[model samples]
Target: QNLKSTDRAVQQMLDKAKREGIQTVWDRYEAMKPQCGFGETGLCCRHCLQGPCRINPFGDEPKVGICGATAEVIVARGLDRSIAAGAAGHSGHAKHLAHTLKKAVQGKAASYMIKDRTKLHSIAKRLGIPTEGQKDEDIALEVAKAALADFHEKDTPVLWVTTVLPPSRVKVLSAHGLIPAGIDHEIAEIMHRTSMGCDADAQNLLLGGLRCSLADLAGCYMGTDLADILFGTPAPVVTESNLGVLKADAVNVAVHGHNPVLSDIIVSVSKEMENEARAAGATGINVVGICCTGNEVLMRHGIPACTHSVSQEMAMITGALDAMILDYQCIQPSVATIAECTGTTVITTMEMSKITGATHVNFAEEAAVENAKQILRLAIDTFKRRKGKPVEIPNIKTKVVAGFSTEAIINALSKLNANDPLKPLIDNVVNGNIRGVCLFAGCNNVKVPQDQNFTTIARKLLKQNVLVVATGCGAGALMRHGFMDPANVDELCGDGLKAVLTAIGEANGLGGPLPPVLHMGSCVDNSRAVALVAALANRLGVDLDRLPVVASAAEWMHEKAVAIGTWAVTIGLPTHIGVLPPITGSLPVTQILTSSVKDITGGYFIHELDPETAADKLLAAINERRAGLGLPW
Candidate 1:
């Protein structure tokens, strides 16, 4: 009866959730059904609210807004503001890390020390800072300061944008005026222009949105770098996934949300609080993850992910999760009520993010460890008294091998050819050992069955020898379905792809093949995939647009997706988003994005909804790129 998810554990919990009369995202979606057509098509405008003006979708008296904004103008402004919101969200996250690093370097936050000095020096030197004789902390402080400086308007283009992307991409972006001056500046400009009666020309507004989207890229790239310096750059990790990972006897704290600055300390403090958990009549403390925070720790620490995205509440429904510790972004506030039903304590750590029924602990870097201990103690104490219901742990879990950061991938490839790691990959692509690459990123949406589109597209692409790299909940989707299990590589991969993977596996001393899909960290770490492609483009003496690579977020659901997809296009990758964005109200706006944008950026949006059709369309895009570069089709 529960047809919401493909994962057996999630299906089991959804049934249980209904049995207990619990409401979920699916229920809420159903209640909000026949959603507003005007909102869906970007025809409604409340930006200034002189009137909550909405343009008529059909032939009617009202053809334009009160402010004389055309349908195209209305749609374009909505998209630009969404881009700005996404950029603000990500850039805010990056700024938090920069602040933490600054505190660490100053010895103000004794709990957080630089975990990877190598990454710190690498970032500093990459930005052309002198790191030769400087102390590691000194170098890190400079890097952190530079990252903080990138948030505001600067005289030069944002270093994270120009430095992380390929020079070829830089040239294209600069020519098109898409290179953001600063992360905050573009986001602010978008907000300003989309207000009252500012930039109303639809195409010009879109170009501004593109600039803001690149600012999002700067956020993602810098966030990844800072994270690696704070918590060591992730290496290959063997882990588990699904609701079954929750243990009935342990104080199971599920770390939800994104930022690892909060989750990482929880991981550390949980280890230290084992005795406290045991004293509270629990076996010990167990730290499972939910959403991208789960992804962060799973990539670095091998912590099992209880669930992600649309199924986050299912973890609470299991009646075994002692607490759901939340940091920020993508966390459903409804989880608080679900936790109350399950006798689970929902602890909101960040001062900025708190739900009505959830307990808030103002977490700061200086007291990170102590605050983490306090949070775990709350879970342990809750576990002691959690007698509201019987534990209904599912007996299903899947083995996951993740942690394929860009450096980790290069390190593994270096084993095959120590001198030039990208050579073997390029040669394989040239010889058709690997037909092309497809990056699966973004979140799951309730509009589609959880993980359905991603797995369907992946199955077809993998058999066609399209190497897959996944991040965010897309990784969660694949790993739970056995896509991240090395043992299934032979079944999931085509002969040519299988042989190449087996070679790399053996070269890297992985006894069998590496997992069919590479788990390249969280959504923010989408930068890892971009860095790999940038390396390939540089090595092959070609621009990013000529590569046989495509990106797909088959089930994206958030505002961040606009910024991400637009940036993907800006960086010259054929990007597909299965869910239709709100721009469809104006054919001019939609047409420019799908067709004319390619003329400027060499990448255009592919709006195919069917998983199978999306797979075929992406394949065609790769082939076209292949022919452009004189590579085998």
Candidate 2:
């Protein structure tokens, strides 16, 4: 019934588009219309009940029954819950990285080592931790211990990672006394505050949630710097996606989850496991990943991701899958129940991520390869157990060259004007033909029908010669569909962009598959995108608000995405997206977020459902800004 209503909305939009003689991404909008309800008006207060307050905008502020909690309270409580969930998810990854660092420091992890010692020393210096004359393990243990302390440390140094954000934001957050004391403490505090008879002030609840979130984020990035130092900064690497990316002639294994610690081991072992598979009379070991785990591998190692969370079951149904190995998040518990339906061996390697029907082989850093090989051997042995006909692989696949981090971008683009008197490429891009940039992002929804919104927005903007920086599943969709590489530039990009692509595209010697789309790593790496824009503004002698740029999320869903959008607008960019949270239920909140906030921040939120319309409108807005600044459009 819900799906039908969504379909009807799309049909209406499509019909309207036809009558109006407008070609729009509304068909994609219709594909995702049902999501507007699910995507925006998030549910709240069902966890526990002093009162079950359902937030509905049609009526008066639905306060809790018998608990005196208003809609604001309910909404705030839901936001708090989201913060806790996000912080917990992010911090938990930090914890695992800390643990691995400890083990590596103790010389227990054989398959991993500090790949960039200078980065290690630099980070240690930043944290005020000494690493002079110490063995890598000793330094690692010391650093890991300090990093772990961020979740609990209560003094002047709340976290070893909080030092990385813009100093102004840090100062403001700190002045408000919102600095999180520890990861667990902050999360627990929010949970307690949102409980039956606790913090009821919406503002207070939000502040506390932001505090907890930042603290955890600080810790994770701090740890990520360490990991990057040890793992080496990730560079552009080629990979494929979708079910078609799966290999039938090899021992196929899917590594699923979010944590890089386990996934990195999986990547290492999957390679060795290939040899083991070949030794065992199988073709070779082919390792693929799903969801955020895919992001982790794709960002760090340039390995191709098989699918996102929505495609987990679809991957299993492939039947060619030898082993479905999981570590954490997005590892559906439902897959455990369906393991019996196929010959594929489902293996759970993380204690926290164990699924019932899957084999549990605890993964330790030292035994990463051995454990992976053991799992690979299980898949090799299961290969002969195949009873059904060969699994059908989707012909829908696209090649992508990912792993472009902000740091990588700086290094690569610096080389453009590196040799001559013009020392910085930032000046070159802004003063040169790259007039503006468009962050073409968000999810690939069924609402968009065959992932058309991404392609449409991407193609439209690329045709305009706008720089489109993408991340997360949206990036995967564009790249997998073969939009990221430069060889296709003449066909897809505007003449000006084609020129830019031709000049900078082959400069890497990485060849034809690369384009100017600039895959700037994972969802969190959106921060890098934010930084790039800020840096670009600085180079162009303009504040971020005055720059010829806009942030757009065509098919966005997720509070984190909202939070990110909020932060982007707060920082300066005019953020445009398809769905705005149904805050229309509250006139004041809506006004504050949309109009009034725009006055204070110099930018505002834009909600346009149609991709092409949104793209063109955004481009007009960018051109207007360029005209305002007397820059070429």
Candidate 3:
């Protein structure tokens, strides 16, 4: 079972689970081995009340569903539904932030204020809001209104997508009818069209999926912008990550989920209530992060990330976590079961995302401070409950240099060349000093060994001179495995990449190497990587499709990853998914995804299960793009 996880700390937790007679995700996966082939191939459909239909993949029984839906149509509809669901998740997150910003500007949200005025001003200017002589709140009100408009806008594409995407790429999307009119509209339309008899054409359905995925991209971009305005834009900070980040002596609170609203306040309240924790017979409050919420805090406040999605329960198994405060997304409901075993309190902060058997503390923006304090006090109280409990924190944490926002990246490059910040990077790529740029993003899947695909693919690409940037759980995996350790950059990076990173680090006044894998924040913060690539493409006088860039979700397991990957392709970058998405039941659908989609979007999906082979294919794709760009490799 140790082979299930690459991290020694995670393996230890697995062993603990066995000794305690507890079932983990890996154990459940093992129990359910030899999984269903029909569902795996996307041949099953339960969209309508009339039927839960299954099509024969071998063409022996029935070739179509009860409603006469072919394999191609069923597969496309399934994918479309996943895309819509993913788009809804991100767009919903953006809507919440936008509404909060509006309330903050109106003085209704007393706990929220503009922490990054610079980001607010920049976003205002980008949205075409006049900022001259206007107060920050006034400009912010307009920005918030504009962002909210993206959800309701009609006759025009979503404002965020139009504002952020390159004009040429936008033109392509417009020409193909792939531009989303509104974030919510696209998502609703996908649901409506994918219903039983609504849209049966596979190609048309896939197009609708792309449109919704573009909406997902818009929402992610807006979320990142608003997050920056509310929480200060992240700058480089040294930190540590792993299950070992939990402290047995301290009041350990693990903030899990994707939102920064509650997590950021938790970080603040933990500081304010540190003495309370000490008074409760603990050293102090040690706030660690899990999942994208972890990425959010790690980026802005240098909070240690304890674990990612699949291993979250394992984090509690250490018996040191006093409370796991969660908001929404990628938080396993099973965590409550594990918490019960370890005497850890699982606190659900979102009203809509309450897990059964977990404490529900509804968080409100108006009373954010009180709510945060209440949550922290609960953690401190729970820390007292662990008085006689056996605590075992593995001695496995890696120092990580995180907080690589696009601005921070540009600032570092500017130190190398003040007049032209992107020149050094572009020159490196042009001269083959850097082969290409690869953005690794997405989640950990139980189907594959945790962190195995991510580390293997990352090491292979880094050895071949790929400039690797990661976000989401992919970054967590790299962090846990020491890929984000600055000390390991020299050892892991190819000679050319090592030299470039060293030169850039030295220029930025760092005496040592920058971490090999740049942590670009959470899944929503994938927009940061997109922004960087857009800048590079503009500098090189090319569209994003022509740039030597690719995105890979090595061990993706979420619907949001599907939306992100779809948008990556729509924006003209080859996307790689290590797990085969359940669309292979239809040969035609698979062909469209793997081959024909590139003809239409200038990008396509590469599905390969083997990490080494996937790396080879990504490198080959990078070289292919480079050669097309008239660059030597």
Candidate 4:
């Protein structure tokens, strides 16, 4: 057995690749025996040609970067850089969607529509744009234009950031000077301040990091809001997960990326092209998902998930995957290389994320539906050519009950007490029926045994009566492990938690309990989980720091995770990260993140490599906040 993943479906694919002498991510990782220490510690800097400076890890070694920047300053600058990158990644995704709406509603694109006019009105009203008696198209155009304008130095602070969080929490950030004025402006300021010989003040550099990271939150909020308007807000949906969702006799197509503008449209086209697939001599078209897009469709349309993040290649190794069409983010170029070995067709849709050797099918939002059909037609043809070839598919998967957006949760809770939905949730927390809440997020890293950390921490937290909600690949990992299956609730949740879940489920007309882990959605939809937290704070007449809630990314490897975690801390939640970020090279930086930062933001990092230790630390944090509320310990 390989020490790679906790999922049996992935484990089998690894074995199959080994049997066939096919290379894999694990093999490449094994070849790169020892990673660079300077890089690992965040001590290396190539910001200027004076050097790709490598600071000594020990202070006695006089560890410093170019321009005589101390190790502490060096580490802070690196952290700030990653925060900007994370913010840019999400912000760019938001702009892409804004452009889609700008075109679609303005009569330039016919492939899209405002699927959730209610959401459009909600956003417009919050931004102080009057939508009353306004055409949906006109309102959407206004919202879209406003979304794009927020990227620059705006007349007001990023409207999403200013409007979304609790006003009290915003004041805390304001007092600390952490409120970002503009998404792009803050990112640029981070770069300007951290430039060589510019900001050697280590603490100031970190303050800049905090400000810029909040921009990342604004980016995430806009991405979630705009997608809901364009693609429709998700409600509860039942589906399946894991590579076993691949069909041996069907034209299997996997959408692997984050953007819904393309993947969501492909979902509709998949229906229209089922006959085309059958005509091509296949049973039908089997459309599954991978990465954040997997969660997108899994939540919105009940599309099954194939795999996620580090294990993406295993989908191809199954030899049943006919095509993998991507949008953007978290896709490995090695995918094209692996597809060459598995007879799978790999495609790049966006100009931003083209991989060598992969076919490119330019997907413009104006031509969204036609592009979707064009891409699936390629899959159908690929499926026919691959017929009579050997096929290997692991027979493993689990039932999934996802689509727990904040709106969906409120809708379910409203069934119990229509007048006050949040009352039952707050009452449960107050009465010790639910001890606290934990949100799991981020991508799976290759270093940890895949899914090992998330499963370990979620199980520990769940049994202690803590409610769990997840997004991104973290959701994928839990669903594959059956944490998102309704049938597992009784065994997975504590006695009181099980009763609470059963009440909500039955009230919502489901005979069984809600899933042990609620799948809120993809990485960007972390906004949904936080939106609920904001509402709770408003109802309790308290700041976010007063809530007994926590967040964790047990197996994260993305800069986006770094941004998300920092923003979560800013919003006053104890955040746990299983990997030690490169800050360990600087004791002051590490101490501030793990301890002293709490004085300023009311939350700090709990960085530990062991899942059990991390889980216990988070439980302690929740109880500490509970004690502050004069609740039972």
Query: What range of 10 consecutive residues in model 1 has the weakest lDDT sum?
Result: 381-390
Clashes of each: 0, 13, 0, 0
How well is each residue in 273-369 modelled by candidate 2, as lDDT tens digits?
A: 5666777656787778776667777878877777763335556655677887787765657667556665678888887767766789888778888
**For model 2, what is the error of residue 319's alpha carbon versus the real structure, in angstroms, after optimal superposition?**
1.6
Residue 60 in candidate 4 has what lDDT? 59
Taking all chains together, each candidate's TM-score versus the true structure is 0.99, 0.83, 0.99, 0.99
Question: Could you give candidate 4's per-residue lDDT for residues 298-384 as a string of tens digits?
Answer: 889999999999999999998889999988889988999888889899989999889999999999988888899889998998999
Between 1 and 3, whose lDDT is larger? 3
Ranking by lDDT: 3, 4, 1, 2
* Candidate number that wins on TM-score, 2 or 3: 3
RMSD of 1: 1.1
Residue 586 lDDT, candidate 2, scale 0-100: 45
lDDT of each: 0.90, 0.65, 0.91, 0.91
Give the higher-lDDT candidate: 1 or 2.
Answer: 1
The residue ranges of model 3 lying beyond 4 angstroms of the native Cα positions read none
